[PDB]
């Protein structure tokens, strides 16, 4: 007899996606929990608030009619119009509903942008410390990435000067995320105005991920929509996940030119089609809902963690938004987090995950009570 053997190959691009530095640490935290350990988990990327009750009530009312059917792939007109009107009023712009595409979280708005704008080999400039999903998405879309590192000594502010220096012919977009995950910084108005100038001159799109724009602890937040006129070179990304603690609903959106929105809408349509109809109605109600209580709760947690860490001699840039604090650790950050987890049962995220080694990310989407206990344990750990 004669034996033959077959390979079972997946696409090379899957390999090209960076490995998780984080999947083992989450499994470690969960395993400590399952054997009766008191793990304080400060790694969350989502608010610890429920969906606002008015949103629940509207979703239930819609649901009880029993009709959950396909919609326009770009989102129901009323949701697009509501989004267009809210963002338009906030930033004194005339946004048409046809400039908006409703997507499965801001995450799919981002992916759709890259797929809509990037030809194979096109380059996107990103700024580290950088959120974990951007690079995977750009890779999946056929693009390449130029990571521009920022520094704690510069308050993690990108250098406009240095950005122009890196522009090449293939540079199709510059991605900004303010307020920033994982640092919590908010980009300066002067930088953004300049970037908008660079985009007109040097012919590239600005993709702006502003999902944390409500969770601001300061009056210095500047949106790309504060410094732009029109959307010719702007892709604006937001959604309901952070602002309304609706992460599991998966509702976000993109606003750009009608041209880009149309392209993005084609991606949306052929990939997932329309998003969950219940979610669309939930989001439409969410537009009417005030999140002031949540934002103030996060502001006071931010103030508490900031004061506490300063006192312990820990080094960091004071976050002005989102719900992260990115602080400096001695040695290897992965090992820092492994040991703190195993010894103190506090879970943090290695800065390595965000391409900035020697740092750790703490989330303060938990009670002051739990934060106090965690910060206690961290202080003990820092003084062996």
Ligand X SMILES: *Cc1c(COP(=O)(O)O)cnc(C)c1O
Q: Which residues bind a second copy (CB under 8 A)?
A: 6-8, 10-14, 17, 45-46, 50-51, 53, 56, 59-60, 63-64, 66-71, 104-105, 107-108, 111, 115-120, 133, 136-137, 140, 142, 200, 203, 232-233, 246-250, 257, 259-260, 263, 266-267, 270-279
Strand, helix or coil for residue 148: strand
- Indicate the residue among 267 and 340 with the shorter CB distance to a second copy: 267
CB 142 within 8 A of CB 120: yes
Beta strand pairing call for 171-176 and 123-128: parallel
361 is an annotated ligand-binding site residue: yes
**How near is the Cβ of 236 to a second copy at its closest, in Å?**
15
- Indicate the residue among 113 and 152 with the shorter CB distance to a second copy: 113
- Indicate the residue among 181 and 257 with the shorter CB distance to ligand X: 181
Residues in the chain: 384
249 is an annotated ligand-binding site residue: no
Neighbouring C-beta atoms of residue 321, cutoff 10 Å:
26
Binding site partner of 239, from a second copy, ligand X, none, Cβ cut-off 5-8 A by kind: ligand X
- Indicate the residue among 21 and 107 with the shorter CB distance to ligand X: 107
User: What is the token pair recorded at 272?
Assistant: 């997932």
Beta strand pairing call for 359-363 and 324-328: antiparallel
Rounded Cα distance, 237 and 88, in Å = 14
User: What is the token pair recorded at 19?
Assistant: 């490995």
Residue number, nearest CB to ligand X: 105
| Chain positions contacting ligand X, by CB under 6 A | 45, 105-107, 131, 177, 181, 209, 211, 239, 241-242, 247, 252, 273
Q: Give 3-state DSSP helix, strand, coil % of the chain, rounded to 5.
A: 45, 15, 40
Rounded Cα distance, 304 and 369, in Å = 11
**How near is the Cβ of 353 to ligand X at its closest, in Å?**
12
Residues annotated within a binding site:
45, 131, 181, 361
Residues annotated within a binding site for L-aspartate:
45, 131, 181, 361
């Amino acid at each position: 007899k004669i034996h033959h053997h077959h390979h079972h190959m997946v696409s090379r691009r899957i390999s090209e996606i960076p490995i998780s530095k984080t999947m083992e640490l989450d499994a470690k935290a969960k395993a400590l929990i399952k054997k009766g350990e008191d793990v304080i988990n400060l790694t969350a990327g989502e608010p610890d608030f429920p969906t606002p009750e008015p949103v629940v009530e509207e979703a239930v009312r819609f649901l009880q009619k029993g009709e959950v059917k396909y919609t326009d792939p770009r989102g129901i007109y009323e949701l697009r119009e509501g989004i267009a009107k809210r963002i338009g009023e906030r930033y004194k712009k005339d946004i048409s509903p046809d400039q908006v595409v409703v997507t499965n979280g801001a995450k799919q708005a981002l992916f759709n942008a890259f797929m809509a704008l990037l030809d194979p080999g096109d380059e996107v400039i990103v700024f580290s410390p950088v959120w974990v999903s951007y690079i995977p998405q750009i890779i999946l879309a056929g693009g390449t990435v130029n990571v521009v590192e920022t520094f704690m000594s510069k308050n993690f502010q990108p250098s406009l000067e240095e950005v122009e220096g890196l522009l090449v012919g293939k540079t199709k977009a510059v991605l900004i995320n303010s307020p920033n995950n994982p640092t919590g910084v908010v980009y300066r108005r002067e930088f953004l105005e300049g970037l908008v100038r660079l985009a007109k001159k040097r012919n590239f799109y600005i993709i702006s991920d502003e999902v944390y724009d409500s969770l601001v602890y300061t009056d210095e937040f500047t949106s790309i929509l504060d410094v732009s006129e029109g959307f010719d070179r702007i892709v604006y990304i937001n959604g309901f996940s952070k602002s309304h603690s609706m992460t599991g609903w998966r509702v976000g959106y993109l606003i750009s030119s009608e041209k880009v929105a149309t392209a993005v809408s084609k991606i949306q349509s052929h990939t997932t089609s329309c998003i969950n109809t219940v979610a669309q109605y939930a989001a439409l109600k969410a537009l009417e809902v005030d999140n002031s209580y949540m934002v103030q709760t996060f502001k006071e947690r931010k103030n508490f963690v900031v004061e506490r860490l300063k006192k312990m001699g820990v080094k960091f840039v004071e976050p002005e938004g989102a719900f992260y604090l990115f602080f400096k650790v001695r040695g290897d950050d992965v090992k820092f987090c492994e040991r703190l987890l195993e010894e103190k049962k506090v879970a943090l995220v290695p800065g390595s995950a965000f391409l900035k080694p020697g740092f750790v990310r703490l989330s303060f989407a938990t009670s002051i009570e739990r934060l106090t206990e965690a910060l206690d344990r961290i202080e003990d750990f820092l003084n062996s």
